[PDB]
Amino acid sequence: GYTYEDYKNTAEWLLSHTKHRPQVAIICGSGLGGLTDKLTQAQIFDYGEIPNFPRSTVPGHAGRLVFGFLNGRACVMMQGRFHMYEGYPLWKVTFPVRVFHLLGVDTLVVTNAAGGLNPKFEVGDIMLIRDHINLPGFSGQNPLRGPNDERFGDRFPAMSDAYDRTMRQRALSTWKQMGEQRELQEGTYVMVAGPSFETVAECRVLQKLGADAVGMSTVPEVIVARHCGLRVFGFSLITNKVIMDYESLEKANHEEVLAAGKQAAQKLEQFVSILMASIPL
Amino acid sequence: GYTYEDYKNTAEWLLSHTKHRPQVAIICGSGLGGLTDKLTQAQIFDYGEIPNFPRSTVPGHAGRLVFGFLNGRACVMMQGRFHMYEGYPLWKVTFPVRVFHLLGVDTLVVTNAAGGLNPKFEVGDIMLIRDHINLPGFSGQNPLRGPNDERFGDRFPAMSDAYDRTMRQRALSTWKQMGEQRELQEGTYVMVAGPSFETVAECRVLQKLGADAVGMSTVPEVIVARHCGLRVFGFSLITNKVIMDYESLEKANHEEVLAAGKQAAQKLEQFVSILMASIPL
Amino acid sequence: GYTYEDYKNTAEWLLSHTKHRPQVAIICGSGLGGLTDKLTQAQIFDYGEIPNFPRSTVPGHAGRLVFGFLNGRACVMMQGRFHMYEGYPLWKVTFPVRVFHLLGVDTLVVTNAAGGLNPKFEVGDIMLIRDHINLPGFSGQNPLRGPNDERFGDRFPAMSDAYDRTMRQRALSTWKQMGEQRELQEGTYVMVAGPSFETVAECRVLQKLGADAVGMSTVPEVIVARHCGLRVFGFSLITNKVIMDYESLEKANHEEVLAAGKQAAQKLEQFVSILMASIPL
Ligand SMILES: O=c1[nH]cnc2c(Sc3cccc(Oc4c(F)c(F)c(F)c(F)c4F)c3/C=C/P(=O)(O)O)c[nH]c12
Ligand SMILES: O=c1[nH]cnc2c(Sc3cccc(Oc4c(F)c(F)c(F)c(F)c4F)c3/C=C/P(=O)(O)O)c[nH]c12
Ligand SMILES: O=c1[nH]cnc2c(Sc3cccc(Oc4c(F)c(F)c(F)c(F)c4F)c3/C=C/P(=O)(O)O)c[nH]c12
Ligand code: NA
Ligand code: NA
Ligand code: NA
Numbered sequence: 049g050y051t052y053e054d055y056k057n058t059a060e061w062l063l064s065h066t067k068h069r070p071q072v073a074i075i076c077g078s079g080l081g082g083l084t085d086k087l088t089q090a091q092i093f094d095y096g097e098i099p100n101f102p103r104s105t106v107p108g109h110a111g112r113l114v115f116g117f118l119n120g121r122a123c124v125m126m127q128g129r130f131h132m133y134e135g136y137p138l139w140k141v142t143f144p145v146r147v148f149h150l151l152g153v154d155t156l157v158v159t160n161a162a163g164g165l166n167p168k169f170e171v172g173d174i175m176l177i178r179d180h181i182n183l184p185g186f187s188g189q190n191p192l193r194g195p196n197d198e199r200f201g202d203r204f205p206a207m208s209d210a211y212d213r214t215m216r217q218r219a220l221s222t223w224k225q226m227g228e229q230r231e232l233q234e235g236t237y238v239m240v241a242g243p244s245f246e247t248v249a250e251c252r253v254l255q256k257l258g259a260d261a262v263g264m265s266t267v268p269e270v271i272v273a274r275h276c277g278l279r280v281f282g283f284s285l286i287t288n289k290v291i292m293d294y295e296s297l298e299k300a301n302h303e304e305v306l307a308a309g310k311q312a313a314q315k316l317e318q319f320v321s322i323l324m325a326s327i328p329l
Numbered sequence: 330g331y332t333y334e335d336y337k338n339t340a341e342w343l344l345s346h347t348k349h350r351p352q353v354a355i356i357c358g359s360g361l362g363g364l365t366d367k368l369t370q371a372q373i374f375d376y377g378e379i380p381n382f383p384r385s386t387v388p389g390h391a392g393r394l395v396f397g398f399l400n401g402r403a404c405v406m407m408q409g410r411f412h413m414y415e416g417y418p419l420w421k422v423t424f425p426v427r428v429f430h431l432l433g434v435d436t437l438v439v440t441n442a443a444g445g446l447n448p449k450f451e452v453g454d455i456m457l458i459r460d461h462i463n464l465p466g467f468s469g470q471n472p473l474r475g476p477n478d479e480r481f482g483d484r485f486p487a488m489s490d491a492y493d494r495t496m497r498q499r500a501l502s503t504w505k506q507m508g509e510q511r512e513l514q515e516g517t518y519v520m521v522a523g524p525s526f527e528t529v530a531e532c533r534v535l536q537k538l539g540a541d542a543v544g545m546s547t548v549p550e551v552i553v554a555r556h557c558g559l560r561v562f563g564f565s566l567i568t569n570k571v572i573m574d575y576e577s578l579e580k581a582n583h584e585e586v587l588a589a590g591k592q593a594a595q596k597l598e599q600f601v602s603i604l605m606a607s608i609p610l
Numbered sequence: 611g612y613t614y615e616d617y618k619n620t621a622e623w624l625l626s627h628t629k630h631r632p633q634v635a636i637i638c639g640s641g642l643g644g645l646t647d648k649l650t651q652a653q654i655f656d657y658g659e660i661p662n663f664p665r666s667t668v669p670g671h672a673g674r675l676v677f678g679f680l681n682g683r684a685c686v687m688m689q690g691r692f693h694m695y696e697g698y699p700l701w702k703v704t705f706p707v708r709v710f711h712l713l714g715v716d717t718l719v720v721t722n723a724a725g726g727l728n729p730k731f732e733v734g735d736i737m738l739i740r741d742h743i744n745l746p747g748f749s750g751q752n753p754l755r756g757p758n759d760e761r762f763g764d765r766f767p768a769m770s771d772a773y774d775r776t777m778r779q780r781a782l783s784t785w786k787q788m789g790e791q792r793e794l795q796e797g798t799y800v801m802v803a804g805p806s807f808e809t810v811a812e813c814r815v816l817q818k819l820g821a822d823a824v825g826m827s828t829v830p831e832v833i834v835a836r837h838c839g840l841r842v843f844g845f846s847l848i849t850n851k852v853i854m855d856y857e858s859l860e861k862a863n864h865e866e867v868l869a870a871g872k873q874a875a876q877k878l879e880q881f882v883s884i885l886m887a888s889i890p891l
Contacts, residue, residue: 105476135475178856179811186812187468187749188803194697195667196805206807206861208853236811241469243477244552245487249460249517250467253538257815271806291489294459299487386757416756468749522750524758525833526768530741530798531748534819572770575740580768 049139050100050146052197058100059150066091068115070124072327073148073278074320075269077160079309080285081127083317087116095128101147102140104128113144119324124148131264132184133243138191142272146200149276155327156273157320161305162261162284163246165254165292166235171304172312173286174319175233175261176219177211182267184241191268192275201275210274215281218326223319235260237284239267245300251290262290281323285312330420331381331427333478339381340431347372349396351405353608354429354559355601356550358441360590361566362408364598368397376409382428383421385409394425400605405429412545413465414524419472423553427481430557436608437554438601442586443542443565444527446535446573447516452585453593454567455600456514456542457500458492463548465522472549473556482556491555496562499607504600516541518565520548526581532571543571562604566593611701612662612708614759620662621712628653630677632686634889635710635840636882637831639722641871642847643689645879649678657690663709664702666690675706681886686710693826694746695805700753704834708762711838717889718835719882723867724823724846725808727816727854728797733866734874735848736881737795737823738781739773744829746803753830754837763837772836777843780888785881797822799846801829807862813852824852843885847874 063069068091076083084090093113095101104111111128118125130141145156162175169175182190196203216234223232238259240246246254246262254262261284273280287308288300344350349372357364365371374394376382385392392409399406411422426437443456450456463471477484497515504513519540521527527535527543535543542565554561568589569581625631630653638645646652655675657663666673673690680687692703707718724737731737744752758765778796785794800821802808808816808824816824823846835842849870850862 132469133471133474179809181809181811181815183467184469185806186745186802188694188746188751189469190695190803190806192805193695193803202864204805204807204862204864204867206863207809207812208807208858208861210809240467241471241474243473243485244466244471244556245485245489247460247462247488247491249462249539250488253462256538257818258811275806296489299489300485301487302483302485305485413750414752414755464748465750470750521748522752522755524754524766525747525752525837526766526770528741528743528769528772530743530820531769534743537819577770580770581766582768583764583766586766 049137050143052199054100055146055150058098058147061099062147062151066115069122070115070151070153071122072155072157072324073124073153074157075126075129075159077285079306080159080316082313083320084114084125084127086317086321087114087118087123087125090114090116102130102136102143105134119321121324121327124151124153129265132189132241133264138189138268142191142268145269145272146276149278153278155279156269158266158269158280158282160263160266160284161287161309162237162263163288163290163300164286165251165262165290166260169233169260169286169289171286171288171308173230173233175235175284175286176216177237177282177284178216178234179211179236180267180270181236181238181257181259184239185267191272201277205275207271207274210270210280212279212281215279215326219281219323222322222326237266238262240264246290248291248294251292255292261286285309285316330418331424333480335381336427336431339379339428342380343428343432347396350403351396351432351434352403353436353438353605354405354434355438356407356410356440358566360587361440361597363594364601365395365406365408367598367602368395368399368404368406371395371397383411383417383424386415400602402605402608405432405434410546413470413522414545419470419549423472423549426550426553427557430559434559436560437550439547439550439561439563441544441547441565442568442590443518443544444569444571444581445567446532446543446571447541450514450541450567450570452567452569452589454511454514456516456565456567457497458518458563458565459497459515460492460517461548461551462517462519462538462540465520466548472553482558486556488552488555491551491561493560493562496560496607500562500604503603503607518547519543521545527571529572529575532573536573542567566590566597611699612705614761616662617708617712620660620709623661624709624713628677631684632677632713632715633684634717634719634886635686635715636719637688637691637721639847641868642721642878644875645882646676646687646689648879648883649676649680649685649687652676652678664692664698664705667696681883683886683889686713686715691827694751694803695826700751700830704753704830707831707834708838711840715840717841718831720828720831720842720844722825722828722846723849723871724799724825725850725852725862726848727813727824727852728822731795731822731848731851733848733850733870735792735795737797737846737848738778739799739844739846740778740796741773741798742829742832743798743800743819743821746801747829753834763839767837769833769836772832772842774841774843777841777888781843781885784884784888799828800824802826808852810853810856813854817854823848847871847878
């Protein structure tokens with residue numbers, strides 16, 4: 049739906065309107081977006097102001113790019129992200145990631161909320177993403193579907209190495225270098241489209257396929273980032289333990305997700321700020 | 330594709346054209362639709378007569394709403410239902426369920442044919458639906474995809490409690506209260522899009538994911554029903570045992586499905602009639 | 611997107627423009643398409659020249675039908691095939707198969723490249739397709755989706771018998787009747803949409819579902835072939851072993867796929883030429 053010149057046009061317009069030249073793109077998950085308050089020399093653009101940039105549908109909170117410095121790194125932050133369940137085609141969801149590349153961004157940090165499928169996980173845990181299962185991708189919902197532009201990347205990119213080995217180590221280390229009672233989790237994120245929450249039978253399916261966490265975002269952005277050669281790091285805030293048996297009378301709800309998001313707020317701003325120092329130049 | 334005012338407009342037109350005020354919506358599976366003959370004060374509307382109502386594609390049998398009384402309950406019955414495989418988007422397939430809600434319907438009974446994946450199941454068995462696996466949903470084929478209307482329900486409804494506990498018990502009981510040689514089955518229904526029948530490798534996949542029965546309907550209607558707060562009960566007529574090995578020279582066919590449907594006809598009209606008395610007011 | 615008269619119009623135009631009356635359709639996988647050089651009385655049509663025929667997107671190699679004789683059989687060969695990942699809807703991908711039927715073709719041979727999921731498989735192996743797993747099909751990406759035309763086939767065709775028993779035997783035999791050090795493999799092909807290569811977690815999923823090989827084609831053509839009653843035989847050239855662990859520093863690439871394709875070239879031209887003699891009349 050976008051031409052190469054649409055991305056270039058959007059990129060140049062952003063370059064013309066900020067002296068900020070970002071290196072790291074950060075995509076904040078639902079209610080982990082207070083992290084814009086830690087930026088310095090913060091310059092804000094509402095999505096509506098940016099050519100070709102999809103406008104958000106959520107009336108409560110309209111999204112924005114915030115350019116700034118986080119702990120030494122020249123950052124662009126996406127507050128309010130796009131999801132399949134809102135009805136965006138994946139070429140709109142992942143439109144920002146290609147703009148970031150053309151701004152000169154070389155690293156993407158992606159964060160999300162997720163339900164715990166791994167029994168060991170607890171509400172409030174952070175799981176680093178070692179790998180993903182792209183269920184939409186298997187069926188044709190891949191953001192690379194359509195003509196490939198060699199200026200962005202190959203027709204057939206690999207994803208076996210999607211989540212940077214170096215950054216995962218340098219994040220386990222960084223987590224030791226704090227006084228955290230609870231250990232830092234690591235695992236496979238499965239993307240489902242949503243927006244409804246899984247049945248018990250569905251949760252059992254996702255456990256058997258070997259997923260540790262389930263969410264409704266991230267994987268499309270990761271594929272497009274890797275397609276054009278960005279280094280990728282990400283993690284999940286476990287907001288809830290997915291109901292895996294028919295005895296329980298507890299039900300997943302977005303209130304849970306927000307609540308866990310407010311509790312983990314300070315911890316996450318800290319973790320992501322310190323991590324900037326571990327990203328090369 | 331529909332606005333809130335399209336559903337309201339359709340609802341009011343139906344209210345203006347019948348004195349019937351239904352409480353229970355019943356969606357009859359392929360050849361379980363003789364059950365309209367058990368209604369009293371039956372008033373029939375062809376889909377074509379009803380504003381905004383998708384017309385059926387099947388030339389042989391065009392669908393209709395029948396309003397009437399079944400065993401004390403004010404019912405609306407859907408004879409002829411929509412399937413993904415016919416090329417309807419899921420917002421058309423599940424358009425009726427939202428109209429039912431606005432008519433004042435508070436309960437949905439959904440019935441379907443299905444192939445047996447559980448080896449214990451036999452042709453002619455009835456399986457109550459305890460749970461579903463929404464394979465289309467994982468990939469983006471969820472009827473809630475798009476802008477959410479708070480007047481219908483939440484952005485992120487749970488489905489872990491989709492199939493009413495009370496009604497499943499009150500249906501096992503009701504089945505005892507008859508002279509049935511064969512025991513009443515209970516299990517997970519997996520929706521696939523069809524319209525072609527599964528390979529042996531596919532059948533093995535669906536067994537490993539933990540499905541008991543496989544069909545091509547129902548799950549989208551259930552999600553939209555739950556989204557706007559209807560109580561949901563359903564079951565499958567097992568029409569065939571899915572070929573699970575390469576030795577067999579038997580092939581699934583729609584003739585099997587119809588045939589099993591004619592045999593189970595009297596049993597199903599009876600079962601669903603008696604069940605009306607167990608639905609609250 | 612096509613009417614019955616579009617296929618008939620394309621068929622008749624091909625009949626009007628060649629005296630060749632083909633019996634066997636062959637769809638050549640990526641770089642197994644030198645096999646057009648073994649035809650005799652070869653008559654070539656570029657896709658662009660053929661009414662209603664999708665034009666290829668690949669600038670390097672534009673596709674063509676080659677009518678000719680291979681080892682006694684009146685053949686039509688498709689060099690350059692369509693894939694979901696290029697953005698074709700499945701009714702375009704499988705448009706040729708319906709034209710073949712109306713030309714009088716009664717047999718389809720389909721070949722593809724694939725990644726090895728079965729640990730026993732080695733780069734350069736040939737796997738006969740006993741069965742498939744249609745992951746896109748489960749979610750709604752089935753080329754039969756939409757109104758069914760009884761002139762092509764049934765609304766609800768079976769696929770449990772998709773890959774001809776007789777031809778698989780007559781191909782194992784044919785392989786003995788050569789001096790091949792390496793044994794001929796047999797297994798389940800899983801179709802995924804691509805075009806990106808699987809993660810380790812994804813590879814593990816496809817192993818657990820019981821797939822031996824993974825590719826991005828073939829299954830839609832097979833379904834439409836069976837729908838209109840063609841006999842179907844096919845195999846995969848194993849071009850690579852899918853990365854199934856996080857230790858490895860090897861990554862799948864399309865260069866691997868091409869390379870394996872050049873090595874297996876002579877072996878495959880031979881195998882498919884000899885197989886013609888085993889196809890009835
Ligand atoms: O058990 C589970 N199954 C499947 N998925 C999940 C998720 S993810 C998720 C679920 C519901 C709402 C969510 O977020 C919003 C929001 F997007 C809203 F717009 C909103 F208004 C809100 F209140 C939310 F909670 C998110 C986050 C989305 P992210 O962008 O971080 O990937 C958490 N738990 C589960
Ligand atoms: O092994 C199996 N695999 C996968 N699916 C199944 C089903 S479901 C199904 C399969 C073929 C035709 C069917 O029904 C029609 C019809 F819809 C027709 F229009 C028609 F003309 C006819 F003859 C049928 F049998 C249905 C019912 C559909 P329902 O609405 O009850 O959910 C039964 N067995 C299997
Ligand atoms: O581990 C794996 N995972 C998933 N899939 C595979 C495949 S299939 C495949 C992967 C990449 C490119 C491919 O082929 C082209 C091409 F289609 C091109 F257009 C091209 F230019 C080229 F260089 C190729 F290699 C094909 C063949 C396609 P076929 O039509 O034979 O089914 C091989 N290995 C794996
Ligand atoms: Na351009
Ligand atoms: Na309106
Ligand atoms: Na016509």
